Amino acid sequence: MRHGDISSSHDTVGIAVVNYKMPRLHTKAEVIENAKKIADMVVGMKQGLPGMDLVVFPEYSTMGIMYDQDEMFATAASIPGEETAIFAEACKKADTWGVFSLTGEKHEDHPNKAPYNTLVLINNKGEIVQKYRKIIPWCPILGWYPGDTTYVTEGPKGLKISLIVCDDGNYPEIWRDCAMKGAELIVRCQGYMYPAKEQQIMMAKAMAWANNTYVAVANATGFDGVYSYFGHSAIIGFDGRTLGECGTEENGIQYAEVSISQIRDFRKNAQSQNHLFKLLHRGYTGLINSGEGDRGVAECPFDFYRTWVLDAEKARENVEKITRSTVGTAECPIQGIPNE
Amino acid sequence: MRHGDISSSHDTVGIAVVNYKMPRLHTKAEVIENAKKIADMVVGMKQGLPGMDLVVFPEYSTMGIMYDQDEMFATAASIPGEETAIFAEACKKADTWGVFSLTGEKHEDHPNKAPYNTLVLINNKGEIVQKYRKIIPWCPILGWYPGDTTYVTEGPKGLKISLIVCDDGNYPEIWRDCAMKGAELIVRCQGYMYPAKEQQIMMAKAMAWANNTYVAVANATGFDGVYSYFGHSAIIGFDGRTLGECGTEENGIQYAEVSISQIRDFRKNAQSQNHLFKLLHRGYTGLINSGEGDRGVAECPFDFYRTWVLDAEKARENVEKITRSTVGTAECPIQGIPNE
Amino acid sequence: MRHGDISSSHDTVGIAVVNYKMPRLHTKAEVIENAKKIADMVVGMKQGLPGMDLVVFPEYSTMGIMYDQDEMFATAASIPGEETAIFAEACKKADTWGVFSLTGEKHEDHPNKAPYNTLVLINNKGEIVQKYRKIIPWCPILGWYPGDTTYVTEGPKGLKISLIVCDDGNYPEIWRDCAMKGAELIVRCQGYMYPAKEQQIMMAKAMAWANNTYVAVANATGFDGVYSYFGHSAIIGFDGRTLGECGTEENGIQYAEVSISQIRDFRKNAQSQNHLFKLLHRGYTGLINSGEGDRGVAECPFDFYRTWVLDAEKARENVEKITRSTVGTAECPIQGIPNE
Amino acid sequence: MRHGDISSSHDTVGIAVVNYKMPRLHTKAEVIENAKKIADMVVGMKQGLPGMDLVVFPEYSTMGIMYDQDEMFATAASIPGEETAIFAEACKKADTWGVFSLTGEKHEDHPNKAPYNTLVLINNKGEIVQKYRKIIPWCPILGWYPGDTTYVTEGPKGLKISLIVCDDGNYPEIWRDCAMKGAELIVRCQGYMYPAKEQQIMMAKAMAWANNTYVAVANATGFDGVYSYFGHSAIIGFDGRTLGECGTEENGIQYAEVSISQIRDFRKNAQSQNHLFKLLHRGYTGLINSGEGDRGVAECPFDFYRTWVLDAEKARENVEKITRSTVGTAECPIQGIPNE
């Protein structure tokens, strides 16, 4: 957990995040060309960052956002496929792991159901070791089929990695779920458009803190014909403190070293802000002093999670009373999204 | 949701938070004296803040932290009791609601089990309308009996209020639970000691954003013989933007107006960052476009919450593998907290 | 007055500001081409921002700065004209209002007097509803004919709008004049070049506060052969707090919702910082308590404004004693600007 | 215009501002005692700040705020009087000029009309050289009789000084009026209570910039039984950049050197942001190039100032349409302030 050098050591994973300029693309040929630009970029970056072990690209960095439905379907990728092979070769050549974005990935029922929005983790031998499908697509504007699972994978030097996408990160639950599965680094890849710049910068830091996890964020930049993306790719410590952070600049890069031994030492020996431990051992001191055992309390005391787990339809109904009953709102209509 | 005036209108609740200097007290008489100081403060503040509808004091503002066990037991309060009556009279006189701290509140089995750490919400008629017992005590150093429930109460002008305490706020789950019950304001009362100053400032803002809720934070200041408390009491909008924030100064005050109609308009008509709505309607656009209904997906896709709810002992075991198996650590021992 | 969503409601106006990359243009054909780029941008942005009601472009976004006098004269626009029609069509297609820049607009005595520097407000039916000519051109370098009037126009959802340009905003008087005419939003369009970046960011916020008005700022970006423009387009609340702010990035966008009912509620019920009210009712409490009526004092107590209004030549003379007597300075000469 | 040393030179005025802890006083004897505390403070400070030429204390630093009317009347000062003599002796002993606050100063019709809220500038020989009565009292809560005039006085080393008070500074007009009279330093003395902390920090800087003037701000700190005062006393350059700024700490001090020759060189040779010059020579380049003389335009183009000057009752009526017609509001009533 240290910032400012280009090296890495046996204890540190060298992580690079990229403020990748958002592509504005329309065909499969243009996607492949851009995929090769990304590959070239990986290779060049390793020349300057000899400590690089992990390189992270934004959601949508490969295809851009395919606003047109037909083009979306025409350019949806197979995993493994040609794009991923192009990425894998860069990872082998530069001897790094990498996180790349396929937007879309063909649905099992392609072309009759919406593509997933997917991330892969590729190791330094070119192997896909994690494929993550976004669980919370950025509705209403974006139309991806939602995925249903998080994953933890052993990464460079044994660092445990989970991947999440853009909108996912607004939801504390996903960051929790990954850390509780053992994630030591949560990588948030995004094409996070203005407006919500300061809110997203803060969310990543707060989530690093709340889940005692390293966080790496690669966000897109530039204007793509619809959205302007605000950059601020960052790597953040498990103590909530930013390691390094980009600005809004096109193809900015940040690079930081995250210590394996430091996070494991913290998760073992931290007390007051060992949040993962403490959530499941509530009031341990109190119970000890009251003659009630030395484990604290594990039971979930939050009715919302309990209802959600046992009766999601009831939890949905409850939330519709507080918000609205239809996915759309007549005060700000959107074609294809129903309201009233 | 507006900052800088001393007024309030029929649409706004005037909220004041206090950077109350932490008391260093030892007897029941000294607690009562301090309670009367708080009452005097409420009355005086209303003279300057004619728009005040809600006044918020820090956790421990009444008793200080009773580090000595015997003194803890001797000064633990009854609710309703003498302290709360002293507070109620100030609320009636100044025609405001208030949030006060009783640390401890006598356990049902007093003096044979540890006191709770409690907050009350008192209305402008002197009535206790919410009593909240802290669910996540600040273990290891602090020895309160944990509570088990959140509450939502109709507050000034109909504003829905939930109370939480200090350490509670590090845990996104509680902020979620309150908002999902309908809370429009979550009041976090704390005696949050250094070191974790920047992390706590950020957490409150991130939680306001993530749960589309007003947040008010009253934190203690000063040095009490053990801890130095970092202030930065604040009121924060439901869009994640700070309204006003104190520094570390003793008996600082902040004051902001939070609009009833604005939060209800937002929760109704917000789309991209309607996080409460969106969590329980995932991928609605995608499902619509894939011919699968217009509600998105409600089902909880996070194995951690599911395991926690169905088998808390398993979730505890899982977390002990990632952290440690005993509440204490031999590398940083604490008397009465077991380790190895 | 809320930030982070892409929606808008019946109570909120959805405002988008653009960090438009400064053009480097030379002919009428190139201006028309760029005008069409702006139009395309409006249409695309509305696809991503369904709540957009008002889109704002920088001063000079259409023509760039025509440094060459001949090119300036050759490209000066008629209002209404071809450029404005191109903008109007985008406003109708995207169903938004827009603020566009014509630099120059032909003088009544074109080509024998310098063009104005002009802004139009175009409604969602394509109609020009306000034409503002800059009152304080950025002398010495820029040679526009000064305009002489501010305007207030009923905008989207009834929101009262005044337009001002760049250098204008350094002068508190203009922001006052607009608010005193009833403006609820002052839109400051600029091609504000480095150096004065932090000063201009602050001025906008201070003016929002001092005049209890929403403020929207669209500033140019990039290097155009002469100047580098610093971006930091922003929307700011009537309480002085930034809603969202761009960085220095080319074609950044910010978007915020400004509440109609909130500003009207504030201007009605604010007391201590109701600056518009208080300026013309000075010392009301004091006069009441002194038995002198319940209106305070309205009379202007500032000799400078009085002299300026009654004898501008005297006020000019006075200022020349404090500064210098000629528009130019021999220590930093500029061709065509006299000194000594 | 330079920060960080304790010295001063023949070109620089050494200015010290004090975050003076707000007194809570009730009698004339207690005022006199506190006045002597201030005197002792001046003398001690000069021991540490050998470059000190000007020392600035907060509004209300002498009396506190006399909330009780009877006590207000009983403690209202004569100028010159006993308090001012106590201050004068400190100024002679420490060989500095000073700015002190008398709240109240007896009205000509004392005790039958409300006291003024007054500031004096005392030179290093003990002489009162400026007496300023606040033009815009902080209504509604504060009940001072409004003054009607600004002043410019030759200060230490010839530096031209104007004094203003607290609420005054929210109004750009007063800062303008002083600078237009020749002020090179505007001293803003305040007991500026929370809430409006960030807004006031920004206002001072913006006013320094807009009026090409040094600004010094001394603000009170602490809690006085009613209000908490936020400190952030500061000295600011004529270019809008802070020299030094206090935090919220009780009896903080800041100290900066402001160059005489630098402001005079700037006001003479600045061009693009010579705001005082440019306001009264609008569009000079344009008029030159259009064959219309080389002075630009002086005429006031802002209808609000013109109406205010010629018909203040009309300007008042106009503003009541935009805000409200009575000084009070039934939604937030205050005893003695009428509404409906």
Next chain:
Amino acid sequence: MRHGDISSSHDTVGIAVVNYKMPRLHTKAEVIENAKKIADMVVGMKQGLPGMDLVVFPEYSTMGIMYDQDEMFATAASIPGEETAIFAEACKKADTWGVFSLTGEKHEDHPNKAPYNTLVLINNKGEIVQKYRKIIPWCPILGWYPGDTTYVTEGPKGLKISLIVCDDGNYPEIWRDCAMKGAELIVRCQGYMYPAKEQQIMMAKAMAWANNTYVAVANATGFDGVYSYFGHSAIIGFDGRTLGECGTEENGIQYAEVSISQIRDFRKNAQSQNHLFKLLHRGYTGLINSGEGDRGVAECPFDFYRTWVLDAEKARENVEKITRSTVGTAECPIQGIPNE
């Protein structure tokens, strides 16, 4: 190198810094009383910070600044002496190391030469393991005899510690000298008075970075009759990033864990910003590629250091040409300091 917990592990040293309120004292008895207050504070702090291994107090925290010469001489301490014994007992009781300030420490020729300004490092057995005498007293106002040596001592858990005082830290040379002797933590104890607040906050961070060293800063707070001290005690990583930082509050505390293994891993394996290594191996890549050996260049290429080392009188003369020839300046005279 991690922030926010109260624990420490076998790899981390738990460092606490104190924003100790500056005493205003006059006699030996009052010094002893205050020394006991400090001791009580250490003991209490350890109760809250079970990970504390090192506690740091400000320069002057024991005596205050003895402005009066006679009182200075009367209260100058012996080391070891009564004060240090009082500190040692607290260190043994709380099982921590500590850094305390003796101002003055008796000169070998006491009372005929000025006292030193001294710091001790006391281990957890009560033993004085380092005594540092300030090399660069804060002339002109402060009159301590200058010391002549830095020291490195093995501290808690083997962490190498050097101590420096206040004004010392403005001079990059001292931070270099300590790190080059092997210091892994440089502790800067100060009573750093306003004005130079932001400059000192930055200096510490820059020095941490430039010398790849942990830095801990304990600075005094409050007003002592002469100076106001600005706090902002901090612990900073060897990568230049702040761990935690106090504000200006009286008796604030910060606490951070600094990893032994992380700094040693960095100093071993860092490349691009291994500043200690690189200073003495300049241009290694270039020399390798030019066929000139694989060590780079060690020779000091800076004529100033060379002249300083070989002929300090010449280096002094040189600097007097650039600044002034006498220690005093007639433009800002100080009694006892000669000028002209």
Next chain:
Amino acid sequence: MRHGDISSSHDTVGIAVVNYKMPRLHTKAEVIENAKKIADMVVGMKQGLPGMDLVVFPEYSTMGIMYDQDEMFATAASIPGEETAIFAEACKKADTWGVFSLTGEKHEDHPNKAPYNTLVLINNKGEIVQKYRKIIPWCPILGWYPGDTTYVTEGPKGLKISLIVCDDGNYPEIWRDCAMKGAELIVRCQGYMYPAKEQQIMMAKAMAWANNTYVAVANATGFDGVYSYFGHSAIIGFDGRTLGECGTEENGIQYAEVSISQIRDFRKNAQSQNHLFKLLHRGYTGLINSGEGDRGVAECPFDFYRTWVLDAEKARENVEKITRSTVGTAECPIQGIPNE
């Protein structure tokens, strides 16, 4: 020392720094083309900045970084040469001085030894008045032959200028060496790649403060195939306060006026933070009061500098014990850099 205008006066030097987009070049023809782009830029900038006296470009702005050895050798420049003539003509035409970068400059033994990394200062008559060869190349990645000397040259209006390059600035020694030679402005030209953005922003400010010198920094921007450069070109006062600072934007510009008389007045009359004076007159007050002369102490009390000067091999050995013995590290190998 003032920010925000485009003018300059007889007392001020108008300095412009450029966030020049890093070139990606391969041949001598492409270098010459880019050199002409820089020239065109200088000329255009002067049109907008009539006060410009000094224009500063980033290290590598002319050639980019020639990563390929053969291309490095093929494009290495002669000084004076064709590139410098192209720059000189721009300086004469725009009547400014300029700082340009030749990377490489041919070694005396070209092409058999690595090129230098060089900066020139060109006066407004086209004359090269300073040629600086980088003393601390950015090893390991960059392979320039190290230079061995700093220089001070009389610049525009007599302002004394020293030039330094990129990595140089991490080392306080060089900034000292220049100031001690009389430098009043140190110009740091850089192509400072991410990661170390915040550290470099801070270093420049800290060095301005520590050496009582103006500092100007021109840093490259953009991505060049290997590195992303973080901009934040800046001009900084001799008091450590930023005048103006760019962001990360391509071809940003900043411009500030630095006063000749202000720095000379400060270096003459500053006392407490006259760091250049004080370093060589330590403890002057103390020695005076102890009867030991009125000059303080000049002798260098830092063993590291003494050893470095007398025995650089010993100082190298010492540092290798603290860091590592070989220029390379087996944990992060780099081809051509030896380790183990």
